[PDB]
Amino acid sequence: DQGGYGFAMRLKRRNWYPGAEESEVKLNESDWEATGLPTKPKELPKRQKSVIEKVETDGDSDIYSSPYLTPQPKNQATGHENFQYVYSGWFYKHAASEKDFSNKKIKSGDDGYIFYHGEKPSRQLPASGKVIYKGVWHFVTDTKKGQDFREIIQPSKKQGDRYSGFSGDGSEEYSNKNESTLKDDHEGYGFTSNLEVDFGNKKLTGKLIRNNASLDKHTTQYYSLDAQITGNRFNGTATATDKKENETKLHPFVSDSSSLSGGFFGPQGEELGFRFLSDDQKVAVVGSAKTKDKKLTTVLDAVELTLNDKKIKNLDNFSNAAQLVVDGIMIPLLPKEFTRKFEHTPETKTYEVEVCCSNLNYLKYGMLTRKVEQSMFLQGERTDEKEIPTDQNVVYRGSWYGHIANGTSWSGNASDKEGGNRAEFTVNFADKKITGKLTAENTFTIEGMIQGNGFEGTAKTAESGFDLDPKAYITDAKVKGGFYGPKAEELGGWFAYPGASSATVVFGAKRQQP
C-alpha cells in the first residue's frame, strides 16, 4: 500500500452522558496510526505506548499486553511461534472513566491499541513454491449503544457498547488461550492465522480462526484472505466467513474488507504483518505470521553510498521507488522539471535530497545530505525475473551522479543536457550481456552478466587515469545493478571504489523504442 513499519489502532470509548450521548462510534481508515521502526519488535510500539502511559487510571495502573510481548494465557500457532522480525498484539489499561458532567462527557472502559510492527522489510523472497505461514491475529471493534458480541466476549461490562470489543478483553473467555493442552484439531492457542503464500504466482490465501475452549470440532473460522503480492508488499481482501443469514450475528466479523494490506519482513520474507478494516467499519484486524520455526529472487534495490568513507549501506524500502526510507522516517520523492531538489524535516535536523529523474517511475536516484553528512542513493523495484525481455539489442539512455578524486575532487550532478553527465547502455538479454558508458566531459566502461532481474560486472576508467577537471586510475571496480519496472524499461546500478583515486557513482537509464 502506502508502506510502513507498522500500524496501530486505538480502542474507542463511547460518550454516554445522558442527553449528549453518541449512539455509535465507528472505526475509520484515518484512525490507523504508524508505529515507526521498532528497535525490538517484541516491545510495544513507542509512540502508542507513551499515549497509554499517560492514560489516567484509578485503582489499577498496569499495562496489560499479549503474553509473548515484553512487559498464563497463550496466543500462538504451534510450530510457528519464534518471531524475530514482526510482532502483532495488543496492550491496554483498565482506564479510569471520564466523568466530565459540565461538558457532558461520560466515557468508561478499557483504553489501548492493537498493532503490528516489524523490522527489516524484505528485499528478497523465495523465487518459487507455496509456503505455509502461521501466526496470530487481533481485532478491535466499533462501539454502538445496545450492541454486544457475546459469542466472543461475555458482555458483563458492555464490551462493544461503551468501549470497543477487542481480543485482549478480560472477558474473551471462549478461546482455549488458558488451557493446558491442545485438541487434535486445534491450530494453537487463542486467535490464530494460517496463510498459504504462493511465491511462484505472486499471490496468497489464508484463514483467520479462533481455537475454541473445550468444555465436535474445536476451531471457528471468521475470515478467509486473498491477496496479490507486489514486491515485498501484498494487497487484497478479507472475506467474512459467517456474515448475516439465519443468525442475528453475535460477533463482529460480519462484513468483508477490501483493504487487506501487509508486507514481508526478514532476510527472505520468512515473516509477515498485515491489517484490514471491515467495509462496514465495525472491525479492524491486525496480524502476523511466519514460516515454520527452525532459491531467492531480489525484489528491490535500495542503497546509500556514503561519500566520506565511500561505503555502501542497504536502505529499508517498502517496494516503492518514490518513497525514500532513511533513519526510520519516510521521505516522499514526488510533490503531491528534470531531476528535482528539496529538503524535509520530520515531526539529524533536516534532510536535503536531490532526486532523478522525472521520466523514471520504478527507479529513483540522487543525492542525500543530513545535518553534515552526504551520500548518494538509489532505489528501484525490480522487474519479475519471469518478465525479463528476450530482446538481443536494447538501448537505454539517462544520466548519473558522480563523485571521484585522485587528488582534488570532482562532483557532477545528473542532467538531461548538455555535455553534462550522460549515460548509455546496450543490453543483450538473450546473451545475458550488458554494456554501456558514462561520460562527464566526453568516462567509464561497464561489462556485465545479467542474472535474473539483476546484473553484475565491472567499471573501468580505462587508459589511463581520467581527468580531474592528475589522472585517476580505476580498474576492475565491482558494479551491481538491476532492471526495474514491468518488462524492464528502467535499469540502474552503482559502484564503490575501492572495495590514490576514489569513486562513488549512481546511475539510471530508460529504455528506448523503434
Chain residues that interact with Na ion, rule: CB under 5 A: 4-5, 34, 36
- Asked whether the beta carbons of 32 and 154 are under 8 A apart, the reply is no
Q: Is 390 helix (H, G, I), strand (E, B) or coil?
A: coil
Tell how far CA 326 is from the center of its chain. 13
**By CB under 8 A, which span of 145-153, 340-348, 373-381, 405-413 interacts with a copy of itself?**
145-153
**By CB under 8 A, which span of 122-130, 151-159, 403-411, 499-507 interacts with a copy of itself?**
151-159
**By CB under 8 A, which span of 118-126, 149-157, 321-329, 453-461 interacts with a copy of itself?**
149-157
As a whole number of angstroms, the distance between CA 356 and CA 412 comes to 13
DSSP codes, 251-266: SS--S-EEEEEEEEES
As a whole number of angstroms, the distance between CA 458 and CA 476 comes to 5
From residue 458 to residue 477, the character string flagging contacts with a copy of itself as x (rule: CB under 8 A) and all else as - is --------------------
Contact flag: residue 150 with a copy of itself (CB under 8 A): yes
- Stretch 214-243 residues interacting with a copy of itself (CB under 8 A): 215-217
Strand locations in 315-393 (E)? 323-326, 329-332, 341-344, 351-356, 363-370, 373-381
31 binds, among a copy of itself, Na ion, none (CB under 5 to 8 A by kind): none
- Stretch 169-188 residues interacting with a copy of itself (CB under 8 A): 173-174
Secondary structure of 397-452 in HEC code, one letter for each residue: EEEEEEEEECCCEEEECECCCCCCEEEEEEEECCCCEEEEEEECCCCEEEEEEEEC
Cβ neighbours for 328, distance < 8 A, ≥ 6 positions apart: 5, 36, 37, 316
Q: Compare residues 45 and 112 and give the one whose CB is closer to Na ion.
A: 45
203 binds, among a copy of itself, Na ion, none (CB under 5 to 8 A by kind): none
447 binds, among a copy of itself, Na ion, none (CB under 5 to 8 A by kind): none
229 binds, among Na ion, a copy of itself, none (CB under 5 to 8 A by kind): none
Q: Compare residues 146 and 514 and give the one whose CB is closer to a copy of itself.
A: 146
4 binds, among Na ion, a copy of itself, none (CB under 5 to 8 A by kind): Na ion
- Asked whether the beta carbons of 487 and 361 are under 8 A apart, the reply is no
- CA angle at 371 for the pair 413 and 399, rounded to the nearest 5°: 15
Q: Compare residues 161 and 187 and give the one whose CB is closer to a copy of itself.
A: 161
Beta carbon of residue 359, minimum distance to a copy of itself (angstroms, whole number)? 58
As a whole number of angstroms, the distance between CA 455 and CA 388 comes to 12
Q: Is 119 helix (H, G, I), strand (E, B) or coil?
A: coil
Closest CA to 223 of 195, 248, 245: 195
Beta carbon of residue 161, minimum distance to a copy of itself (angstroms, whole number)? 9
Beta carbon of residue 85, minimum distance to Na ion (angstroms, whole number)? 14
Q: Give the three cell numbers for residue 223.
A: 475470515
- Stretch 244-303 residues interacting with a copy of itself (CB under 8 A): 246-250
As a whole number of angstroms, the distance between CA 30 and CA 28 comes to 5
17 binds, among Na ion, a copy of itself, none (CB under 5 to 8 A by kind): none
Beta carbon of residue 6, minimum distance to Na ion (angstroms, whole number)? 6
Closest CA to 105 of 168, 22, 206: 22
Contact flag: residue 158 with a copy of itself (CB under 8 A): yes
Name the residues that contact a copy of itself, by CB under 8 A.
146, 148, 150-151, 154-158, 173-174, 212, 215-217, 246-250
